[PDB]
Design a protein around this ligand. Structure first.
Ligand SMILES: Cc1cc2nc3c(=O)[nH]c(=O)nc-3n(C[C@H](O)[C@H](O)[C@H](O)COP(=O)(O)OP(=O)(O)OC[C@H]3O[C@@H](n4cnc5c(N)ncnc54)[C@H](O)[C@@H]3O)c2cc1C
Ligand SMILES: Cc1cc2nc3c(=O)[nH]c(=O)nc-3n(C[C@H](O)[C@H](O)[C@H](O)COP(=O)(O)OP(=O)(O)OC[C@H]3O[C@@H](n4cnc5c(N)ncnc54)[C@H](O)[C@@H]3O)c2cc1C
Lengths: 401, 401
């Protein structure tokens, strides 16, 4: 079952979390990790936040201390694996044997086909190298265009505005943060960015570019010194596809992290997996999933009596003065708003319910509310709705009961 | 790998096809099939066609001759399996051991929530028992309402009209056959059924029913003596879900039929699998898939050097005077129409292309065209488009080259 030696492809958060948990749970056999980036393993959330602002990569490294006795092959690409021979072929000419193979290869930014032949700077934001490249162009008074309405682009927008960069943004949908965010939150976030000087363009798509100017499908133009494309990511599942595993923009896994190929597991951004709230398969693109799924899969490999992965989804986003936290589903049949939604010292909580049951929550500048809401969410609590709205109501009280 | 004994859950076409191929390929170990219906294994397409018209079940049985030495446990339900103990628990109190387990449990009609408490006859059409029940109510001059725009309901509509039954049909979408059928075909099919006296209602949903009358979301009413609901099917994947396999309205499998649980395979209507034309996972609800996937999975189990399942999708439908055949994708960036589309002796062919490459085809009353088109489709042919349209062009010529 858990058969030595263990080989992990990818050296991001999911991989680090997984191998640390293998060691902590008591597995003492060989562990080898193959990472294509020639970088000490690092966390990605800082890249559009404090790193983009302050540039010190030695503040963003992952702690591999809880993963002793691991050989990290950095700057090496796994090119294929043979699931019958139980081997992995590396770009440096070597081959690794495995008893258990774990695919933790993440996802890469989608390219925008209409900007393929662009003759102006066009970047995406995924890696430390990407971040350094973009930062090297955040000249004060320069003009940045962001393509996409997702959180990473908005975090970059906020960082850029703080640095004195003019920012425009084009969004194909009618609202920002179309994925996994309540409409009430999305509408407020737009109001915030607009108030901070971001030039927002909704329901627009990029049709091309000419001599430093981007073209839109309404027949208009946006000049910029740099374009950062952030229209989502695609799973890095090429090795899995070639080896015959079930994949569809993501490697299908069950709650034990098993793929359709025996002795091969997958975790993190590369996986398509069950969302227990919706009961549907989804590719879950969050820090908490990478860590939590990695830990759960490792724990169950060492101890088969352990339950499968069961954590509910959540993420956070730091956008200027907004500290955003979102858990569970974006919507249900009811939203309860705790507090006022205002640009004057923003602070509020949203709760989404389905037939009385909490299925999601949002906190903006209220971390203290978020933890008890996540616990209520976890057991599908059906609290008193007026109490949920009432500001006199304390939420940590409810969760404890 | 192929480990004896083999146990198959379900005794439909996929199961029969699979076990016959195991035997033909040379596997001589135990095979036991568990089938919940107390019926000699039978084919479903006749149920909305000649059986509905003529009633002889001994014309619709599957040939189990190519599957010698198989014990068929008919009228028995598999209630669970334990993938660690390698056992299956049966409704009759017995337990079966397995080396290889194959889930071939098909799919069941979706219920219509708004008709849940109906006090008038409401049926679905999946089984021989369903067909006999519906047929027992096809009184000449009676009124039948069909809910859904799919092929099975339309086949029933045609059968009913031929039998002198008044037929009305409510479709939530703007067109019939929304799944896997070109719009040109769907529009023609509506014209045909309307000409045969079917009362078609598009963009309408059922909101409920009262004392023999069905209510619609436009505030109107349709009286009927019987309602047949045909709004699609849901995979019978409950055993897989309970046992920890990756599922989402269908058991995920790769081209070898492997699930995420070692030693457990799945085939047929119950599976969610790669469509090689779209490159996306889909639940493929066709006779040809059930047979072809069953055969391919069996062949590769006995001979691991055999390729995985690779057949492209296709189906047929018999609707009164229309003998419809459809292969591949419903659309691309071009449709070529061979012949005229007319209610006067209907006979035409559609070809769908994507950047010059054939990705789909349709034949109405032209079986001779369909086989060569499927071969051209299979190798992604890029034929001369004017020739494809030209009636002087023979298609069997093209395929042979
Ligand atoms: C800029 C940015 C900001 C983010 N902010 C937040 C946030 O505030 N909150 C939040 O919840 N989430 C955030 N995320 C999301 C989060 O960081 C991801 O969910 C997480 O990185 C996924 O981890 P992973 O280990 O699955 O994948 P990855 O981090 O992508 O790691 C995979 C690694 O495998 C490598 N690899 C791929 N193929 C091969 C191969 N064949 N051989 C060897 N190596 C290979 C990759 O190049 C990569 O280094 C952010 C992400 C980015 C990019
Ligand atoms: C009325 C009708 C007309 C059709 N016409 C056409 C057509 O003209 N062309 C076409 O391409 N396709 C047609 N089809 C589709 C086609 O018949 C299906 O694709 C095919 O039946 C799928 O085969 P299967 O073996 O995967 O599933 P099934 O035929 O559903 O067989 C599965 C069996 O497993 C049983 N089972 C489920 N759970 C358990 C359990 N726990 N224990 C034991 N047994 C269990 C089921 O009850 C069932 O008997 C038609 C289907 C119907 C219903």
């Amino acid at each position: 079952a858990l058969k030595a030696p263990v080989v992990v492809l990818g050296a991001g958060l999911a991989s680090v979390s997984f191998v640390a948990e293998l060691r902590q749970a008591g597995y003492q056999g060989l562990i080898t990790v193959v990472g294509d980036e020639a970088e000490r393993p690092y966390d990605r959330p800082p890249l559009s936040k404090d790193f983009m602002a302050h540039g010190d990569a030695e503040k963003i490294r992952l702690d591999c201390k809880r993963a002793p006795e691991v050989e990290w092959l950095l700057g090496v690409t796994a090119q294929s694996f043979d699931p019958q021979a139980h081997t992995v072929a590396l770009s440096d000419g070597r081959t690794l044997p495995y008893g258990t193979l774990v695919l933790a290869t993440g996802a890469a930014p989608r390219a925008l086909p209409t900007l393929q032949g662009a003759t102006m700077p066009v970047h995406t934001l995924r890696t430390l190298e990407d971040a350094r490249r973009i930062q090297a162009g955040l000249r004060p008074q320069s003009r940045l265009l962001i393509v996409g309405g997702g959180v990473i682009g908005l975090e970059l927008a906020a960082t850029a505005r703080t640095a004195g960069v003019h920012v425009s943004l084009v969004c194909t949908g009618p609202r920002l943060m179309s994925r996994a965010a309540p409409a009430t939150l999305a509408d407020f976030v737009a109001r915030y960015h607009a108030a901070q000087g971001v030039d927002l363009r909704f329901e627009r798509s990029v049709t091309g570019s000419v001599d430093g100017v981007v073209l839109l499908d309404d027949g208009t133009r946006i000049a910029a010194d740099m374009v950062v494309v952030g229209i989502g990511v695609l799973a890095n599942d090429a090795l899995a596809r070639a080896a015959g595993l079930a994949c569809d923009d993501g490697i299908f896994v069950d709650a034990y992290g098993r793929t359709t190929c025996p002795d091969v597991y997958a975790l993190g951004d590369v996986t398509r997996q069950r969302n227990p709230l919706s009961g549907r398969f989804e590719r879950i693109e969050t820090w908490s999933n990478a860590q939590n799924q990695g830990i759960a899969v490792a724990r169950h490999l060492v101890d088969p009596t352990a339950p499968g992965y069961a954590e509910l989804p959540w993420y956070w986003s730091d956008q200027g003065a907004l500290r955003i936290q979102v858990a569970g589903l974006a919507s249900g049949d009811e939203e309860i708003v705790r507090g006022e939604v205002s640009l004057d010292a923003p602070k509020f909580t949203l709760i989404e319910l389905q037939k009385g049951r909490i299925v999601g929550a949002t906190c903006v500048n209220n971390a203290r509310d978020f933890a008890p809401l996540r616990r209520l969410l976890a057991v599908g609590a059906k609290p008193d709705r007026a109490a949920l709205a009432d500001p006199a109501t304390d939420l940590r009280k409810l969760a404890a009961a």
